[PDB]
């Protein structure tokens, strides 16, 4: 999403 | 011995005024020894030397509202008294068992009566809540094609669908509908129900979920009666032009109920603990500073200013009755202002933080900015060790954990196996252990600093309630002083968890007003837990028990990921702005952006001796007596022996025994020190410390590192072992003795044939084990969903977040019971969730305005121009969507209209990147590596003069390959130069065993590759016709050409001459032999 | 009369300025950029032209050489090309050939360098490789021992230096747009000329860089220049036309040809353009390369190699043998060419003509 590295 | 930097000896007291040390016998001796009398603190005690409306009759039931009704209808399932007084368990309805032969439809619930008369049983009307009275003893219905046929068996017309009413019993009518929104005057509830506006705020839960009774829209703030309004005791306030005017303005002269005003002139009456003050009709009490008016309005209590307001002291705080005093932790001196503490040791701090490709060493003011290491894959985690001056990190690209000294020497890799997704790590400087979270195995690990003795200490879920579980672990901090491990979770049920360092006492710390807790850390001076949220954009801190939360930044942060505190300053890393920046740790004042990082700065730490405070090791010497891990017990005082993961802990009479439980597919070392995979045995590299992994009778290794070698010179990946497929040509991968105890990783489930598949795949209506074991009906009926997961009637398992989300997930609709899916227990959280207008599901706030229909009815995407993007780290696209600023000009369309990439200037590459012809950046590792990466092949341009990195073997053609790929029996350069100069690998002159064909240039291949059209080895001796004349050039598999060379398989008549005389592209062999015999 | 040479993206066309008609030349090629020629080095009657190729996709560019007839006309001759083996070329926007010393000069716009090698392109070496944004076409003046180059990046400049890479200097840097082509008037005191695709002018200046003059204005986006006799040649890139004007800029803009926009350069093929009478100053003492300089010469080593310690002539690197050249079809006066089993270019004379290559008859 928007947090996964 | 030493005096530790800035600190004092163990038996010495530190003068908080200036940091000088005095003997312990001098403190609390009755004489001020320090410059500011810190040795004579208050904490040391001195020396010791018509009757009624509801009277009714004996045959009539009595009602609260004043009605009288016949006693026959009491507790019949419906209100007869007119006020429910005959329909409650408050007086009596618990035993409302009805009359005689009535059918008891137990599916009915208090909104309806379970007992139904047989007068209308099977009458065609849905008497029961799911109409079971129409099937239990009833003649079948033929139904009609013009009517809606319920899948359960009932028959109704199409007027009974999409109306919030269970006409079919099985909700088949209401299931799958797409209810249009409510009307103009109609009110809408959270669960999508439509109710008349008049029915708001009437003490009846008409919305079902209580939407129409919400406090915000129902409570009427009483007229405040502000300045120029005298609030009289009656509540009908007037103007103060009328105070004590002797005219009754407020009912019984409440405005003149008292005009003496000075009611404080007494002791027993008005009793105020401290001071009193009069008012226009009466008195009120007040307290001295540092005291709180409690709920009785008639006393004063001392507040704990250290717990209520920690920002009043820079460090450890001490409460006093009526006030507080700010102390400083050891190693800090108290400033003359009386509040700020200042670090004493001359070792000044600096910030160690990690980037993509980089680890950087930054001074705390932004003046100095250096490079520790470069060329790493992706450093997402990092930590240091004060005792050995070491440094640890996680390279997520390679899935390994490295370590090196702080002076760039002795780079080593401690853990390199079974690392699937490690998101964070922390170093335990006390008991010399290493901790790291796994986001794929969903667990917590502990290990020795050198890498041996890995063990699990947390898994599954935390609370006894199985609501918060290990969905997405991220961020970890240790508090070894009290033996606790704090980690943050950013799953759908996000929280912050705590567990003892030996796995005892796992509990939940913080689980409210939190969505994306990326960062976490503890301040070791005042003992305050710190964390930040990536979605809500705050920085919050609280006591170690999760109490007395306070907010530093309130919604002003784009995206924190890591943070650390030293002294009074907090440093955090922002993804969206790609910056490292700092501010005050209590209120956020003094915000300064320290550095423009091109890549995302992931993890940050402050390297200073005080950030890892010293104290005595519970496992002091002899490793606590345990042959294995000596862990700190919960509370920090005791210790607990424990065995590694692949061991069985068995308790003797008074001490612990560890038994090896190495599985059949694994090799146990000779000293029983550890259990390693069987393909690590005889691989040529010594893994066991005793060398037992490499016996004397080792067969020749045909296969690479990390590859399983079959019993006869054939290779396969380790995943092939016991997967119920014949992978080895010999079949040794499916051997019985090898597989008979093939216990595999925890997060997957094992089938009957001992092949194992991911745990969720069982009972998903797909035969995955190839023996139908995972689809066995009895097993699915009898199994259990893992903790934190709901169990379907189908036997499938789904995450708890899929329950009551409208969309079916269990095949059968037990995961969406609308009777339960609309109650008040499933209201959305008003902070982090957005309620759909029509459907009853709740979706996270960040899913709103993303270009995707998460609510299934475009509620989240409608009216997107009303959403204002974040002011600091967001960019607004043409279609008015908000995207992180880090995705602008990144190279990909990220909002569906190319707006993020319109008018884009190329960026300048960093210190470890090479710039292609078209000005894009690729790592320096990709230059001269025998593959195209710049599109225009620019990475391989002019690869003769450039060196290769010290671990790379340069090919004579100028390209580079890792030095481990030389002298191995196969060509890794594109001209076999890696093997060309290699020495003879056998005393008898050859280069590889007798089971392999050997080409001219010392590279060699398998037998079956000879004469296949594939130039297996360069300068190929495989395509030598003279030696290949006698190989089996057989018609069923090889086309024997006229020139006596044979052609492998499908290459015949393929369109290109693979033979060399033109008859490969010819007739009479690839044409019809006898016209399809 | 001089013969014009015009390279298109796929083919090379030569046009006689007096006969006013085209003739057949090299075909079946792709992404060629610029050409230059050497006048019959072996004095048999065939000159050598050098043309580069740009690259697309995975494959890289290269430099190739081919033969051209020096007589009136030649057709049906199977012209064969040969690659110099110069690997790793991105965009050779500029190429020049030095007839004194058998050296070839070219610059890579993407690599931001200027290379040097022998006519067969073996002894590769970087001459200047620092402070270039987008190096444009180049020019060489062996008589004065000075080479010229320009830049068209963020800082448009025109520079000159010795042929061995030292004594680099900038001619002008003011009132410059997008330089595209360079030319030197070998007879008018070695005056130099250059174009501009933004200012749309052609200017001239002396070799040292004094008395800058605006010769002609509003040239409709010129690309390349060539000076012969007393006239100047340029090509409008966006339209493909060729024009003439007095080299002193006091005459009307005459029209010559209209060609497709694939036209890349205009080059005059004549011996008097280069004055082959210049002698070689080299003493044949150098080991690998003998570069030129004003009043003398110098020795050089291949790229990534240095001289033996103590010495300044002998290089440490080995020396590879030269590359042989295929024979051309010398068939003259409307003859035809044919290849036998030996693959020698055995000509087929026309009616009334005799001899080996059918010279006269
Ligand atoms: C980069 O920085 C690292 C770490 O700071 C340096 O590595 C250290 O190098 C020093 C030597 O310069 C090492 O010191 C030697 O360690 C030996 C082993 O000590 C271990 O065990 C003891 C006891 O349990 C622990 O206290 C200690 O922490 C270690 O775990 C000692 O036995 C050696 O002592 C011997 O020699 C000395 C004289 O030098 C005698 O006085 C003694 O009697 C004895 O004969 C010695 O002290 C040190 O171990 C290394 N670091 C660590 C902690 O491992 C790098 O050298 C440095 N690199 C550069 C290039 O600067
Ligand atoms: C990976 O696994 C494959 C499995 O096929 C191995 O391939 C086999 O390799 C061996 C040689 O190491 C071959 O053995 C030869 O078999 C010939 C007859 O083949 C029949 O019998 C074998 C089993 O023995 C069957 O597999 C096959 O289908 C046939 O039914 C013999 O005639 C050969 O002996 C002759 O040559 C030898 C020297 O090689 C002489 O010493 C003898 O006197 C005699 O003249 C030989 O025994 C076997 O056939 C191969 N299998 C197949 C089907 O091709 C690979 O070896 C292994 N990986 C690697 C690269 O080692
Ligand atoms: C130069 O030297 C190398 C050795 O350094 C020679 O290569 C050897 O060649 C022989 C004969 O082909 C090989 O012997 C055969 O090996 C087969 C499989 O390997 C066995 O041995 C290894 C250990 O090397 C074990 O780890 C493995 O598990 C296997 O057990 C066997 O199947 C063959 O068995 C047959 O003969 C034996 C007696 O030798 C009988 O007991 C059996 O019943 C059966 O009939 C055989 O043992 C040997 O493995 C090769 N060694 C290596 C390492 O290459 C080269 O041949 C020589 N140069 C040349 C080209 O001639
Ligand atoms: C609010 O509360 C405090 C405490 O009730 C009141 O303080 C009172 O202050 C006066 C002046 O400081 C004190 O009187 C003085 O006492 C000393 C002896 O301690 C004496 O030597 C002086 O001559 C003088 O009398 C008084 O003791 C103190 N109250 C008590 C009971 O201790 C204050 O007046 C209150 N103020 C308000 C806003 O109501
Ligand atoms: C990150 O950057 C900082 C500052 O650039 C580095 O701090 C410096 O570390 C070196 C090595 O310890 C110190 O050098 C030593 O100084 C003493 C005198 O103080 C001298 O006697 C020694 O011979 C040696 O030269 C330097 O003083 C120190 N500076 C400060 C202000 O701390 C830090 O090491 C860097 N971190 C890493 C891991 O690169
Ligand atoms: C764990 O779940 C249980 C069951 O839902 C919770 O206990 C009930 O919570 C509801 C909330 O409305 C109350 O109505 C019930 O009275 C509670 N008690 C029981 C035994 O049913 C429990 O609160 C949850 N765990 C925690 C710690 O909150
Ligand atoms: C084990 O866990 C429990 C719960 O986390 C701890 O109990 C808390 O202890 C503190 C004092 O240290 C109390 O103030 C809290 O009210 C307690 N909370 C609850 C709900 O029990 C307990 O201290 C832990 N003990 C150890 C040894 O770790
Ligand atoms: C000057 C000196 O050697 N001081 C030392 C310090 O360097 C460190 O070894 C410390 C450990 O307790 O002991 C003392
Ligand atoms: C010996 C030497 O300087 N080798 C260098 C090496 O250190 C590195 O710079 C490499 C890639 O640029 O090229 C070369
Ligand atoms: C960081 O970026 C801004 C522009 O985005 C730039 O002006 C600033 O100089 C950079 N940081 C600092 C403080 O130098
Ligand atoms: C809405 O969020 C606030 C945040 O303080 C919370 O206090 C309040 O209880 C929430 N409303 C409801 C109905 O829960
Ligand atoms: C110490 O002396 C004080 C004097 O005020 C008290 O009497 C106190 O109770 C004494 N403590 C003990 C233990 O006797
Ligand atoms: C199912 O639940 C049982 C207890 O009812 C066990 O905990 C078992 O381990 C569970 N299975 C899975 C897959 O977690
Ligand atoms: C290979 O042959 C050389 C001689 O050519 C040496 O004998 C060498 O020792 C041989 N290789 C091995 C491993 O013994
Ligand atoms: Ca004292
Ligand atoms: Ca009733
Ligand atoms: Ca009925
Ligand atoms: Ca319905
Ligand atoms: Ca209501
Ligand atoms: Ca009044
Ligand atoms: Ca207090
Ligand atoms: Ca997970
Ligand atoms: Ca959430
Ligand atoms: Ca955010
Ligand atoms: Ca091993
Ligand atoms: Ca298998
Ligand atoms: Ca399945
Ligand atoms: Ca669902
Ligand atoms: Ca959405
Ligand atoms: Ca983008
Ligand atoms: Ca590459
Ligand atoms: Ca190799
Ligand atoms: Ca082959
Ligand atoms: Ca074919």
From TrEMBL, chain B:
Disulfide bonds join 56-68, 63-81, 143-155, 150-168, 162-177, 182-194, 189-207, 225-237, 232-250, 244-259, 703-715, 710-728, 744-756, 751-769, 785-797, 792-810, 849-864, 877-895, 889-904, 909-921, 916-934, 928-943, 948-960, 955-973, 967-982, 992-1004, 999-1017, 1041-1059. LDL-receptor class B repeats lie at residues 389-431, 483-526, 527-569. It is found in: Apical cell membrane; Cell projection, Axon; Cell projection, Dendrite; Endosome lumen. Belongs to the LDLR family. This is Low-density lipoprotein receptor-related protein 2. It comes from Rattus norvegicus. The lineage of its organism: Eukaryota, Metazoa, Chordata, Craniata, Vertebrata.
